[PDB]
Amino acid sequence: PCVIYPAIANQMAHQMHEDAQTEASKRGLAKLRADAKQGIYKKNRKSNICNITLQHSNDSRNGNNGGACTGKDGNNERFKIGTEWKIGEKVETTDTDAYIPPRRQHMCTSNLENLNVSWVTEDGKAIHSLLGDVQLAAKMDADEIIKRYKKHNTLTDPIQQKDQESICRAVRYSFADLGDIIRGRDLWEHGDQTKLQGHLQIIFGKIKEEIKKNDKYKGDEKNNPPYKQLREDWWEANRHQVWRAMQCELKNLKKSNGDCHYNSRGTPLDDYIPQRLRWMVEWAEWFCKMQSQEYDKLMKQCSQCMSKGGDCRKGDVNCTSCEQACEEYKKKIKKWEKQWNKIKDKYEELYLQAKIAFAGTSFGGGDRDYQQMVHFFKELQKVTGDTTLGDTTSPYSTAAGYIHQEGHVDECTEQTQFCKNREDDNYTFKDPPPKYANACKC
């Protein structure tokens, strides 16, 4: 049901992590353990990871231009409430769409986009040189998230508890996105990302020959993405050192429990949740921030037209400002609602195909994440018992149910239910607000 069922996504992610660990052990997980200090950067043959600088990078550009955040978020939109998510610049079919989070679009990966593949591989230490640039991007992106979140929301120095958790989640989303970029699972197709993926395909080609000194990855260049298994194993071997680079900045926050409980101990499991589901949960959080802000504008502009003995005549300025505030509310909620209808339809299509595709049968796929989505939903349906057409006992059968099980929608005010029925008053996309239906009419 959309409207107590246990939340199990995180325990499912733990299962995916164990499977990746054991499968890497059968191959060359041990030969892929890297150390940034053992790499060579800009041909320099000469401590704490939190002291990594711009010199420990193979960005092929001059000083002050080879930073990881170089030229990112020129309009300061990354963490501004109300920024509209836009579709990927996929020009081939456009039948398939996934909305890009503003945090992801302005991610600090510029050093990785402008790598010199010779400097990374010519010395035969591409395993260690790649980790240095990944750790540099992870640390600078985490630092930029903390500062720009406080800037774009004008957060005073005593940060509230809910804003600290929101910042901690954003850093976990960035850690998961970076793992999907390295492994080739990331869904954003763009000019800069195509160039970035091209560098990794050359680097990991040399890596396959670097550790080849039997071959545990025969035919891995035939996989899609190229070197799929070798890149999954490299991530398993070094994912914790990547999160350690992000912990250098998270320790400056005071909250240490809740979603911030990985700041000083442990490694989060977000990188094993399919990216299409992570972005949906992030879409719902930022929709609720926009909705709550627009709702406050409606409470103040229409405050006078609420009581039968108010101060709001049907032609005066208080009624006019209230009707104009209702019009702006309906327009913003409607355009966000159009995005949700495409998101929830794709969710349901993948969920239905998961419980139907047998061992030897398949629907064809086509999407970059089809296999990862079907496998995740199959293991979810196996635990919950929802394996036939007709079972409506699990909330995970709809996107709205997934949000209410795993999402963070406490900031939605009065309009909190992401499903219509089971029409309703507390529906998030209700065009006439039940509390202000009469206020907009004066």
Residue numbers in the entry: 733 to 735, 743 to 785, 790 to 956, 964 to 1172, 1181 to 1200
What did the paper state?
The IT4var13 DBLβ domain adopts the classical DBL domain fold, consisting of an α-helical core decorated by extensive loops. Secondly, a loop from the DBLβ domain (residues 1107 to 1117) interacts through backbone–backbone hydrogen bonds with ICAM-1D1 to add an antiparallel β-strand to the A′GFC β-sheet of ICAM-1D1. In the unbound DBLβ domain, this loop adopts a different conformation which is stabilized through crystal contacts, indicating that it is flexible and becomes stabilized upon interaction with ICAM-1.
However, the parasite also displays members of variant protein families on the surface of infected erythrocytes, including the multidomain Plasmodium falciparum erythrocyte membrane proteins 1 (PfEMP1). ICAM-1 binding is mediated by a subset of Duffy binding-like (DBL) domains, the DBLβ domains, which are found in either A-type or BC-type PfEMP1 (26–29).
